[model samples]
Target: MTTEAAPNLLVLTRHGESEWNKLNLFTGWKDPALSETGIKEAKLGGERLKSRGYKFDIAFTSALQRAQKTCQIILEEVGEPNLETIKSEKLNERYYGDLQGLNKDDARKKWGAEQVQIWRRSYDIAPPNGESLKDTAERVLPYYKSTIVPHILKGEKVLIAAHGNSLRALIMDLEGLTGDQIVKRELATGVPIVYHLDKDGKYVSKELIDN
Candidate 1:
């Protein structure tokens, strides 16, 4: 038995693997189409949401195709092919800087695996010319608080299709966690994390639409 008000619905999903991802490439701010498996992953996620009776009043996604396709595919699955989807660069993946487009093994070869790991996992240490997780939160947090949270407060159902780091930033805030805790919270591609929030945008309950 729930209360009079329906908890605000916030659905978050990372884009499925892109062609670059399948190749094990670091694709920050790079555009790549989804691989066959990636496409199917997106479709499967949508099908799950549809079966569960999920509906969205609006959607948000990064400018990246991988993320956009997730929103398009999921919305279509849930019967909202042309939903008003806002695309924002603010939701882009963390910038890889000098490491962009390089394979993980290659980066490890140059920078050593531990150092590469530091650049990625450390909150403040950004790669050369790239943004850190800290930097990412600077943008992502503001975007979520200023642009997106209002929609949730107004009882509108929402969806966001974004990248790993970008979503981590939002989830970090939503979960009231530090960057270290966020680093450990791995996001599975195409899996939906559904959050029910109160008027204050604090989560009342959450679920992962994983099967």
Candidate 2:
């Protein structure tokens, strides 16, 4: 057996704001380009990692454009612009279903604010025709287990750029947080959350980089 563990690096960061984001719309699974502000946020995020001297062996992103761009920008900043980035719908945002492109406030007014609140906040209650956090986890965790975990165990520097709900689902499992805790957990846009794992793929430490 090897005497010591490899770097076993894992970095997770939510994509920067989308054009829908500033307008207070629910992006869900819709494809929207990053807003100007979002592009800037992504650049800043890359700078944060570059300053820390972090690089990647392989990168991951959703099939959606916003996250894909964020992954590209971060890779460019880290001097790996040509690195291979794997895209999967499994990493896509929670299927917002009927709510995909609607304005958040409009949804609240149309479906009683309380109902929207429940769908948004309560863990297992999916929106109309949508996946709940639980359902989202069902898809995300399996991909994470099958595809991502092996890379970490192999000691690769892994980076993933995904959406809020998609990332929240993975974070829920990564830290062993209960459904309630992950529902309330808010990740900073573009800020990288780095994880170090042991040789066995067990979590060793986590760090969030803002500076």
Candidate 3:
């Protein structure tokens, strides 16, 4: 008799809101810690995953403290505090260059709203000295293929905690989304996206855990 193996699973989540988020600042490559509500959000995300009986064999996160903290919190809540974890700059948020520490509204004031919107929403148009979304995908997709995909092919459960744009890049690839579609995609902080993959590492199903 032949038996089928369980599908491989991958979970992706953005780090909870940061201090910069509270201040409406551009947070690219800024390592601000989570706000109080951010901490609560992370914990609640963990609880939701626990209730779904999800456990990870391995975890990946950006080098930023906020993403790292979210990964740790989820692992702790899921009773896998010692799960193997990897951190890399490849998963870091897109570099915002001159806009790094500026408030979004102030940036809009400095560079007119239409110009700022183009920079923020356009696929290839970068902000002053900063990376565009297209630039972000260049680094993120390769890492996802070389480092993350192999494990999923081997049927390991994987979790990734990262920033908005970084996770968006990965999500675009996973969902086969167009650049325009991805530009409009918004990931809420601390929500988990669960993906099931076949043995060949092709996507089979996806779930957004809102709770």
Candidate 4:
């Protein structure tokens, strides 16, 4: 029988339903707190980690309020309210361009379904003035390499709470997922995706926890 070795650990979670999310809007780069349902999701996410007997040594979050609040609530569940947290604008969600405050259905109605789909799912295509997932990855991945990877190398268990696109960037790069694959991949709100990395910084395994 073969035994798999454990790698450096990290957890990634998306914030739960925001008011904009409830409204099905393009919410990139906008700062909003979680809705009541989102609050429950956040608490449940944290409780899952705590119940799994996991603890974080350090944390990272976006400057956006939803991400920050999610991190705080999750940490509260883990009984680590005092955990060190670093916030960065670079970690903020992908910029949604002119669609920032617009409703998704309305945007689709305004811009046609095909165009809106391209803007939302295409790796290199940005909406009217927004950044593409590729554009976001360029900024987010670098910060992860420099800031987050080193701590994991030193054996610190880290948690990151950020936006969908930002976390997707990290996951796509780390897991070597293709553009098409990542574009189609969906991460539920407030669900934790845990990664274990090998010494060489390659992915060992990943687990998803939803509550």
Instruction: Give me the candidate number with maximum lDDT.
Output: 4
Question: Model 1 over residues 1-211: C-alpha lDDT tens digits?
Answer: 1222457777777777788887887887878888767777777888877777776677888888888777788777767777778888888888988788888888888778678878887777889887877788788877788887767767777788888788777777777878567778777786677766666566777645644
Task: List model 4 lDDT by residue over 79-155, tens digit each.
Answer: 88898877777888888888898887888998777888788878878988899888888898878888876666666
Show where candidate 2 strays beyond 4 Å.
1-7, 109-114, 200-202
- Residues 85-203, candidate 3, lDDT per residue (tens digit)? 78868888888878898888888998777888677767778888888777887887777788877777666877888777787777777777786798887777767777666565546
**How much lDDT does each candidate structure score?**
0.76, 0.74, 0.76, 0.78
- In model 4, state the lDDT of residue 25: 80
| Model 4 TM-score on a 0 to 1 scale | 0.90
Better of 3 and 4 by TM-score: 4
Clashes of each: 0, 0, 0, 0
Candidate 4 has an lDDT of: 0.78
Residues 54-77, candidate 2, lDDT per residue (tens digit)?
Answer: 766677888888888888887777
In order of appearance, the predictions have TM-scores of 0.90, 0.88, 0.89, 0.90
Ranking by TM-score: 1, 4, 3, 2
